């Protein structure tokens, strides 16, 4: 059946406002005249793609029996000279002459661009034609554009398209409402908690919920395609009625899908777990606590009346786990994640760089909550004064763009910026002030217990000889780093593989699992060529930075 | 029979199942989809490298499925008159919808659908908005599914990449060894083969080849076989004897010849001029030769062993020593002998005058390296681009620092890191940044010392391997007399 | 600032026209070290685009008579990179210096920041202020 | 010819290419020679205008798409091949790249014999010395 008003969710105030604007001045014209007002000429709708605009238009078309007249934006043009203006004029004339109708203009930006900074001439003619006609009762026009700033400002004025309605992304309750709306005509079996699914679904807006539902359903359909050996010759009967979507289907779909807004910046899945990051226990605990509180129970902060810090900087020597911690956060934080590499955004053209910075930060704010990991800040946020070289002033301009989009951050949207550099000396002192990256985490060289935990975390998924004492490796190893331990285990693995290949070749030669696990001798031989990655001067510099 | 079927494409099974699902299941068992209320996806976007097989998939769907099929080439829709492009799109969609449940295919959608924000030509933005409305809107679509193909999906307007318009994005990516085996079996199913041919070795030795590359390989092999017998019988236009027309038999040697000529199409631009050198040309330094060959040949020949332990291989090496010890010679030997692809890079080659193009160049080279993996990347004179991050205040706005940061992130960052082997060669290892010499970037620091007496003797024997000599000549004296000499002297 | 040619100065131009229209107004220019960059610092440039922006600003700020009574607020962290041509008196004269808070100022700041804070009744911020001496307001 | 296809009018370059290929295929087993392809086949990412991107996409679709070709061969000439769209440098579109490089001594002698077959030479002129002393001559 036709989409009724119940079919929309996640927008209470906006839908109520649209109902007030569209129904009352059309269902009761006499009462408005008695009060002494008149209906507005038009109403604009804007917002991110896939939010419910077109849904709202069809719901208004269905609920009210008033005559309707659709004119899609790019459908007003014509090859014949000036027949486009005549078409639009005849559209409005028919809409008025027939009845107190309602007109919905979809994608107006295609036929309502800023009159200045244009090249064609028919576009100006149609813009002026619509401007003068709709500038001249009991009929209202609804415009729905995905990008509101590409409109001729002459239309954004009293008397013509005066009432705007910010159709935004939903909240948790609205998203749950949408989930309920879509799941009404579906077999949910008996084990499902949509409240948890909405609390975990963070950035999705409107249609993305439908995508989630469809994907979960598809997974369920896949489960019963071959497990029952479904006959492709003709349809089975009893299996069709035994279809029920489980929780695992929805979790599987959620683990695959991503918000449409972040679809461009999707990062390839790299598996890491919180037990994989050996050592640094307090750092992981503090990071989890600081990142989880604003999203899990902000009411405590509201009672406290103080907003949380939304930035953090990892600094320390190379090969300690900064990128490892960031990757683990990307994997197991239950929030969106945008990874950027230092000189990724810069471009030769003038301004494009800052355009990229604004686009990325806009994407971060849109799919809130989000965690943008800026790795190697010594490229985009180096010392402003230190950069004496005048590459045309681009570096200062990008630094200022980053400051304006990082310091101009409201309490809403909870965007957490993680910085990570191995040289803390190069970052501009403006950055390292509270309000942008207040917290400063230092990742020191591992200690004996930390080193043992790191080792156990590295070769956890590696069969090894049972009588092996990792504590020995940790002992007599003082200045090493996690990367060095990785090098040691990789050397041991290489020696084991070499022994395996030699034994297999010998076995094949004789013929025509010798080494199921790594022997202690492999580890003994791997340690002959192990050296510290970081010298003492670097440690001196980092200690000086810490003490300063 | 000649028409491509689903059996005529291989190397990608998951994506094949996904596309078969979307195109067939709502048109073969609709009641099953009527059972649960939710409707199936009705829009799919295929994206991937250029010669991966996207258009082949579209052709297979068109040939196999019994539903109506309508074809839209990318620039084909647009026309000169002012209001004709949108009229063409509307007419196309109306034709597809009116006739039957149908599949539209939009080939090279990147030409029709720009970002709608960076573009400046009006007609483009009106055609994009017309597409947006036609594909989704009031009375969106009855029983018509839309397939699009592109090579750069990031150049598409985000409004198209939303559910309802393009619901699922399938990635037709580079095959694997089993994929290359399947492709080879597909393309050699009708040609005439000699019994000696062994396709498994060919699939193993082809590294980074994607789709059409395999076809090129077989075609070249055939061409060589034709150029082996055309010398026997020639310019007999009226007729060719049946003894040579039959019993052609493309030998395995032909395939080896064609494999030696060709290279992965992705690396077409960055091919290195063939400088043939063998392992016997490198005298002395046997242990370094063994370590290098073991460190390169094990991950590419014995993947099962690494998985059995579940530990990643080391993927770095740095040669350092006095000039002329044999670093570049070792790199040349690796380039000529090892089966993996070779990327030869000079020191300052990657720098550029403009702002940001140096790091763009680095990203492109590493993108090619990660595309045709397993690959070897040789950074000659690594001290040229990777210098200590001293700030470079009296420099080109610290462009060297950004280059070093780009290299750092590219060799170890948010990447899958499948198989890229970086080889460094510097005669000044003190100027290299300490943040690259740690393990995980360049794991093995190999010192190439000055040759000893037996190493000088080995070098002398190696360098005279193709020269006629005096019978009584004893090179042992020359070795005994040179104490501090190097290979170059 | 914009990539295309001419458009940049047009954007500064329409914003200042809008400012002139809705007089009185307060145009807040944050981070002038990006707009008012040291004139012609080095020959190496994008294309005198920073210089064109500065000239557009100079011609559009000198045409401020008594009428329309507009007021431009600047705010920078690094005052060393501000062009002297725009800091000249009669163009942009007033120079307020905002120093770091002192102990009494820090206590006032803390009391203003803890207005909407259900603090424990048996708590006083005077100790923190007396101890925290070189602590900025952000601290 | 290379830039022979470009038109001021919007959506006409591809019309010219389509008409050309249709004419080539409608007649007989034909050959299409496209001279100086670097002017109508750039990298599609360094360019900014839309008409070049669109013409390149039309060319790519023409050379390899549904209903690809039927006994027609495309030949191309270029002075710098690295500045060509990678999507064109693959089997099916441009199967093999022939390298027409500088001749060696024998090649130079062959060229000299070719170019001096219509002149009235003296008896005292030999070409072997001439082919020897000429080193970097491209023919």
């Amino acid at each position: 059946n036709e989409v009724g008003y119940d079919d929309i969710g996640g927008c209470r105030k906006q839908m109520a406002q649209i109902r007030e604007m569209v129904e009352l001045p059309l269902r009761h014209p006499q009462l408005f005249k008695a009060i002494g007002i008149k209906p507005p000429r038009g109403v604009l709708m804007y917002g991110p793609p896939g939010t419910g605009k077109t849904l709202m238009a069809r719901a208004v078309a269905n609920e009210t029996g008033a005559f309707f007249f659709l004119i899609n934006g790019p459908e007003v043009m014509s090859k014949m000279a000036g027949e486009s203006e005549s078409n639009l004029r005849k559209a409005f004339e028919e809409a008025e002459k027939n009845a107190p109708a309602i007109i919905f203009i979809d994608e107006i930006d295609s036929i309502a661009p800023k009159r200045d900074k244009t090249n064609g001439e028919v576009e100006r003619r149609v813009v002026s034609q619509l401007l003068t006609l709709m500038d001249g009762s009991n009929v209202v026009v609804i415009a729905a554009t995905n990008r509101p700033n590409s409109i001729d400002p002459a239309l954004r004025r009293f008397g013509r398209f005066d009432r705007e309605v910010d159709i935004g992304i939903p909240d948790a309750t609205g998203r749950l409402e949408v989930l309920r709306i879509h799941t009404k005509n579906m077999k949910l079996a008996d084990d499902v908690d949509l409240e948890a699914l909405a609390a975990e679904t963070h950035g999705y807006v409107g249609a993305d919920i439908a995508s989630l539902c469809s994907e979960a359903a598809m997974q369920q359909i896949r489960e019963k395609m071959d497990l029952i050996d479904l006959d492709e010759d003709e349809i089975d009967a009893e299996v069709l009625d035994s279809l029920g979507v489980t929780m695992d289907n929805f979790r599987f779909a959620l683990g695959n899908s991503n918000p449409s807004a972040l679809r461009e910046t999707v990062v390839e899945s790299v598996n890491v777990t919180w037990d994989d990051v050996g050592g640094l226990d307090e750092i992981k605990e503090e990071l989890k606590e600081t990142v989880e509180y604003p999203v899990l129970h902000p009411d405590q902060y509201t009672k406290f009346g103080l907003s949380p810090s939304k930035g953090v900087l990892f600094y320390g020597p190379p090969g300690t786990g900064k990128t490892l911690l960031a990757k683990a956060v990307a994997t197991e934080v239950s929030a969106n994640f945008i990874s950027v590499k230092g000189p990724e955004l810069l471009s030769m053209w003038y301004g494009e760089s800052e355009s990229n910075i604004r686009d990325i930060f806009d994407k971060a704010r849109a799919a809130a909550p989000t965690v943008v990991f800026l790795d190697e800040l010594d490229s985009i946020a180096k010392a402003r004064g230190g950069s004496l070289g005048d590459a045309g002033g681009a570096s200062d301009r990008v630094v200022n763009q980053l400051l304006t989009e990082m310091d101009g951050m409201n309490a809403k949207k909870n965007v957490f910026v993680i910085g990570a550099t191995n040289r803390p000396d190069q970052i501009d002192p403006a950055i390292l002030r509270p309000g942008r990256l207040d917290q400063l985490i230092y990742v020191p060289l591992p200690d004996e217990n930390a080193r043992l935990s790191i080792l156990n975390a590295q070769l956890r998924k590696t069969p090894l000889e049972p009588g092996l004492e990792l504590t020995a490796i940790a002992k007599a190893t003082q200045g090493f780093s996690g990367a060095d331990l990785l090098y040691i285990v990789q050397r041991a693995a290489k020696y084991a593989i070499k022994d395996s290949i030699e034994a297999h070749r010998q076995h094949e030669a004789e013929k025509e699992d010798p080494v199921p696990y790594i022997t202690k001798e492999h580890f003994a031989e791997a340690m002959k060529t192990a050296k510290r990655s970081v010298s003492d001067a670097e440690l001196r510099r980092y200690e000086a930075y810490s003490q300063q | 029979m000649n028409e491509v079927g689903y059996d005529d494409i291989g190397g990608c099974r998951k994506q094949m199942a996904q596309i078969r699902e979307m195109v067939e299941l709502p048109l073969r068992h609709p009641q099953l989809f009527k059972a649960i209320g939710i409707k199936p996806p009705r829009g799919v976007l295929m994206y991937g490298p250029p010669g991966t097989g996207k258009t082949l998939m579209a052709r297979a769907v068109a040939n196999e499925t019994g539903a109506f099929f309508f074809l839209i080439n990318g620039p084909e829709v647009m026309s000169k008159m002012a209001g004709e492009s949108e009229s063409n799109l509307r007419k196309a969609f109306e034709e597809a919808e009116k006739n039957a449940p149908a599949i539209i295919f939009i080939d090279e959608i990147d030409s029709i659908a720009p970002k709608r924000d960076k573009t400046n030509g009006e007609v483009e933005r009106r055609v994009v908005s017309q597409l947006l409305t036609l594909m989704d809107g009031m009375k969106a679509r009855s029983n018509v599914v839309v397939i699009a193909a592109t090579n750069r999906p990031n150049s598409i307007d985000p409004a198209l990449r939303r559910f309802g318009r393009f619901d699922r994005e399938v990635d037709i990516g580079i095959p694997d060894a089993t994929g290359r085996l399947e492709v080879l079996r597909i393309h050699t199913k009708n040609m005439k083969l000699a019994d000696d041919v062994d396709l498994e070795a060919l699939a193993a030795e082809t590294h980074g080849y994607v789709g059409a590359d395999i076809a090129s390989l077989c075609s070249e092999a055939a061409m060589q076989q034709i150029r082996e017998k055309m010398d026997l019988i020639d310019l007999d236009e009226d007729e060719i004897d049946a003894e040579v027309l039959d019993s052609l038999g493309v030998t395995m040697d032909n395939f080896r010849f064609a494999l030696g000529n060709s290279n992965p199409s992705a690396l077409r631009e960055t091919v290195v001029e063939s400088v043939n050198v063998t392992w016997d040309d490198v005298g002395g330094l046997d242990e370094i030769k063994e370590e290098l060959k073991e460190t390169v040949e094990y991950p590419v020949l014995h993947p099962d062993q690494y998985t059995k332990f579940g530990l990643s291989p080391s993927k770095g090496v740095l040669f350092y020593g006095p000039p002329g010890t044999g670093k570049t010679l070792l790199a040349k030997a690796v380039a000529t002998e090892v089966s993996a692809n070779f990327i030869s890079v000079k020191g300052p080659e990657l720098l550029s005058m403009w702002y940001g193009e140096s790091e763009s160049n680095i990203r492109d080279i590493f993108d090619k390296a990660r595309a045709a993996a397993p690959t070897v990347v040789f950074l000659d004179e690594l001290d040229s681009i990777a210098k200590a991050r001293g700030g470079s205040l009296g420099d080109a706005g610290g462009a060297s620092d950004r280059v070093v940061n780009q290299l750092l992130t590219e060799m170890d960052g948010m990447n899958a890191k499948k198989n890229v082997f970086v080889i460094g060669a510097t005669n000044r290892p003190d100027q290299i940044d300490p943040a690259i010499l740690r393990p995980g970037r360049l794991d093995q620091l190999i010192y190439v010392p000055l040759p000893d007496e037996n190493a000088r003797l080995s070098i002398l024997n190696a360098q005279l391997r193709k020269t006629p000599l005096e019978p009584g000549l004893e090179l042992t004296a020359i070795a005994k007399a040179t104490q501090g000499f190097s290979g170059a002297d | 600032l914009s990539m295309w040619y001419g458009e940049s100065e047009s954007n500064i131009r329409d914003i200042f026209d809008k400012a002139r229209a809705a007089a009185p107004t307060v145009v807040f220019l944050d981070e002038l070290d990006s707009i008012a960059k040291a004139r012609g610092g080095s020959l190496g440039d994008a294309g005198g685009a920073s210089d064109r922006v500065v000239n557009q600003l100079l011609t559009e700020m000198d045409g401020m008579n008594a009428k329309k009574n507009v007021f431009v607020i600047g705010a920078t962290n690094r005052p060393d990179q501000i062009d002297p041509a725009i800091l000249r008196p009669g163009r942009l004269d007033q120079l307020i210096y905002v120093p770091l808070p002192d102990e009494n100022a820090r206590l006032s700041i803390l009391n203003a920041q803890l207005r909407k804070t259900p603090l424990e009744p048996g708590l006083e911020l005077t100790a923190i202020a007396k101890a925290t001496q070189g602590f900025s307001g952000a601290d | 010819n290379g830039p022979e296809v470009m038109s001021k009018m919007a959506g006409e370059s591809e019309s010219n290419l389509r008409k050309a290929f249709e004419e080539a295929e409608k007649n007989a087993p034909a050959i299409i020679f496209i001279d100086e392809i670097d002017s109508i086949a750039p990298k599609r990412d360094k360019t900014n205008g839309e008409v070049e991107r669109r013409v390149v996409s039309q060319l790519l679709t023409l050379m390899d798409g549904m209903k690809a070709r039927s006994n027609v061969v495309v030949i191309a000439a270029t002075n710098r091949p690295n500045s060509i769209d990678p999507a064109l440098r693959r089997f099916g579109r441009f199967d093999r790249e022939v390298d027409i490089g500088i001749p060696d001594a024998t090649g130079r002698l062959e060229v000299l014999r070719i170019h001096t077959k219509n002149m009235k030479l003296a008896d005292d002129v030999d070409l072997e010395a001439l082919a020897a002393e000429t080193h970097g001559y491209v023919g």
């Binding site: 014949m80 053209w349 681009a394 | - | 440039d45 294309g47 | 009018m9």
Partner: peptide, 22 residues
């Protein structure tokens, strides 16, 4: 009848220079 013409003229690029400090 009218017609729509396309035009794409140019843009603005940024160069990078090297300096020497005495």
């Amino acid at each position: 009848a009218a017609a729509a013409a396309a035009a794409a003229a140019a843009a603005a690029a940024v160069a990078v220079a090297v300096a020497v400090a005495a």
